[PDB]
From a paper:
Two glycosyltransferases (GTases), SdgB and SdgA, are responsible for the glycosylation of S. aureus SDR proteins such as ClfA and ClfB. SdgB first appends N-acetyl­glucosamine (GlcNAc) moieties onto serine residues (O-glycosylation) within the SDR domain using uridine diphos­phate N-acetylglucosamine (UDP-GlcNAc) as a donor substrate. The subsequent addition of GlcNAc to the glycoproteins is catalyzed by the second enzyme, SdgA, yielding glycosylated SDR proteins in which each SD repeat is decorated with GlcNAc disaccharide moieties. The glycosylation of SDR proteins mediated by SdgA and SdgB protects SDR proteins from degradation by host proteases, thereby circumventing innate immune attack.
This study reports the crystal structures of SdgB and SdgA from S. aureus as well as multiple structures of SdgB in complex with its substrates (for example UDP, N-acetylglucosamine or SDR peptides), products (glycosylated SDR peptides) or phosphate ions. Altogether, the extensive snapshots of SdgB complexes in multiple states provided a mechanistic insight into how SdgB recognizes and glycosylates the clustered serine residues in the SDR proteins.
Residue numbers in the entry:
A (entry chain A), B (entry chain A): 1 to 496
Amino acid sequence: MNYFVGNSLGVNLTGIEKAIINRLNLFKEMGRPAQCVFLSWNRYLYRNAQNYITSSDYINMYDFFQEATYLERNEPFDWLSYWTDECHYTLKHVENSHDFRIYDQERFLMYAHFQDPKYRILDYVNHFDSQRRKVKRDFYDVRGFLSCSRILVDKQQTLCEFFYNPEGDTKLEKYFSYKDGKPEVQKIIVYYANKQYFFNNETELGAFFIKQLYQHGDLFFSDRNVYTAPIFNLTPESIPVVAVLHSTHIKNIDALDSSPFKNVYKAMFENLSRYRAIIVSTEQQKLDVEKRINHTIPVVNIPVGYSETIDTPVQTLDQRSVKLISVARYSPEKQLHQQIELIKRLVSYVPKIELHMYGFGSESKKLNELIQKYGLENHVYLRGFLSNLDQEYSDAYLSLITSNMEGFSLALLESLAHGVPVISYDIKYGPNELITSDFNGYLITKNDEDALFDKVKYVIDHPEVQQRLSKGSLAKAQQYSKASLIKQWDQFVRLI
Amino acid sequence: MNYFVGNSLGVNLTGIEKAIINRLNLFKEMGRPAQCVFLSWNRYLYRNAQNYITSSDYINMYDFFQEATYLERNEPFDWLSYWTDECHYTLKHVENSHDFRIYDQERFLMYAHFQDPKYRILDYVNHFDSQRRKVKRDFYDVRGFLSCSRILVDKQQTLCEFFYNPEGDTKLEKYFSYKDGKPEVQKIIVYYANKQYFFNNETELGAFFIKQLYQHGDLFFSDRNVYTAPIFNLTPESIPVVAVLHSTHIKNIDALDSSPFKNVYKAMFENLSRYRAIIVSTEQQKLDVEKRINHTIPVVNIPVGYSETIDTPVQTLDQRSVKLISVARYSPEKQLHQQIELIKRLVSYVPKIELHMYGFGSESKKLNELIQKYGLENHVYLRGFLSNLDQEYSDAYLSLITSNMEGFSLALLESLAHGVPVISYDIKYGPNELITSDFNGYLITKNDEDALFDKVKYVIDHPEVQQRLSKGSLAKAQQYSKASLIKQWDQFVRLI
């Protein structure tokens, strides 16, 4: 059995999360058993994984110990008719919210919070004593069951939390002591195998959990090396684990030799004999990493992404309008302001020009402030993250990348696959390998926005070039075919 | 069903505890159903009640909610062979103790404490985090099961405790906030009837518990009015409760009218309409209480004690030795130093004179310091509390009372029943009613130790008087026959 250990799945899948799900889906078609492992306690992981993987394709560490691994949404429960009718409570609704303040004849007992406005998903219930101190907090799983009660000291500080199975029995206790005004774990108690287990740390918990999963002939893959690497260090070398680096390995990629390893990858680099091999997306990173590693351990380039069959419309270009697209999380590294600037000084040459920015991150408000400021309300659109952008690549003229560090770009390959050529700063890793300037898009010089504006403008000018590049895009997309990577993965696993 | 609500049973039965058990044993022979109710959380109440009542004669409030009402000692468990063999722990024994320090390969996890030296009764286990902070304490019932985990904050302060049933499910949560450097309850959560219940206070818990017990035609009796009276105040008047006063009702018994009610009985006196009637031991206290109450509610004198069949030896007096006896808890009110003094200045007239002081309280060390100081090692004996003093009344010449306030004296009647006359300061209540000077012992003037010494000396001088008084002792013992009180109790219950 092959295990792809990450942290968890977001509401919006991240680059690492999409890469993991891709490995799983290839291993599915290949015929080899595989499973995603998730370490992070997250009571919405059921909802988050529904449109991508089955509850049997994943084990969550906390679910495992909560005997809630492969549990489904149970039947919905009317919490409000329970409280009113059954409990003879009264429910003062909080205004502009899915919240409530529960009372028993003028005794304030609890503050209820729901996710949804239909009041079907109970999020948390907060408990109060005689003097309206918030003593205890009850968190609920999206599948219904009470997952975790947390106990508060002083200023709503976390003293300890208790994780329950869906039947209500305690399976896990965590004891917090406040270091640097933030709750640090100091004791963990795990009820498992009709026995009591003690760990000082969530890492020690991580290690225990792996040793349970592990049978002889099973293989691990560490994908959030921040958390996964420290967990594997406390695991016997007898247990094979393969490092997977999801990005650039060093702080400044221009200083190949005189640069520290990223805080995230420092642990695995320190214990390089622990890992059977290490996997990057790009040939360059295999070469660069192996030199820095000095060939202590084998390195392989298997790309996080692949091209699949296209059974939606490709390159149906309305000759009157020009759709440019960014498909990138709204984070600072992606430098999406430069694209709003580019569209600023480009409307006068191409009016009825549109830029559709697919993603949701932290820079949402900062980005929105510019599209407003420059009057680009009717030309630039902050389209929320969405999977199945196949209908959204159909009328796309170009893809833009203006990030500075990317590693393999999943959104870059996805563009080429839909025959949409991409104009990207010439950075490491990914764009270099995936783009041949004047083959399937252009490599621009880093942060050289005038070069950027010139080529984007040139490409909007001669559609004969867009069509030529759009062809070669599909061509390049094929070298990363689902077959190319099923084999490439199968060969890698067999050698190990 | 008749319920006799107290707090709990000690290792050593108190006057209130013995009085309650007596009521129960009379109601047994009478044929009316009865049960002791105990409010106090005490995990040794099983052991404490074994030689006096059956687990079906008593309901403990916490046992009730812990689904541990009428549970027996389960089979003994080798905690040390569990920890060594099963858990692969190592057990560093603490010297001069039934304690242990549990370790997992040099990780200090828990401090184990047993009651017994056979290491069969596990008392408590204390839990430690990475930095040897005492985070959590596990208390065990004497019947085996984990009763209560307690969670500690700051300086081993109680933040909250969780009460479990023997199967391990949580039945009760208590949340503490520190007022005046001592843990005060502020929230209680009770899992009962497949529902959640909230109380601010242990009194509110007390009231709830009663309303569950109570069926139509059931009768209550409040015997620790400190705790029981406040509990009954929050109970519907529909529920009959009868006050039972176990002592003198006022702070100074000499100030019948210009004296405050005792802190212990203040609550019932404030809510006198709540109680259907009020029961004292002595006729005098019925008269005194009814005048102070102004006859708002009926008062009855039913004595806490009775005389039973004597099938052990009575008055087998070794003519060469003189055994005097105190049968009184070693507390200050009993003034037992005066008896050590009396024996001091009495050895020279009666050498080979013995005083046997049956009791255990707080004054043990203070009392022992005098028997030592005055060289009375071979004449005065601090015999630990013991029930079945029937073999111990056999060679008794006299009983001494030198207390100042007593109410009915159980040990006084018990003396008379064994034909042992008693010499007692002339106090309220009890001695006045039970002793007729020159009938069955003598009433001495309060704290008049020279009068005391004179009569005790006179009675040791003429054994013809001891025999005459010893007869009339048995005579008086009969007026308080088990039959006299079965009837007296039956008449009282029927009128109500």
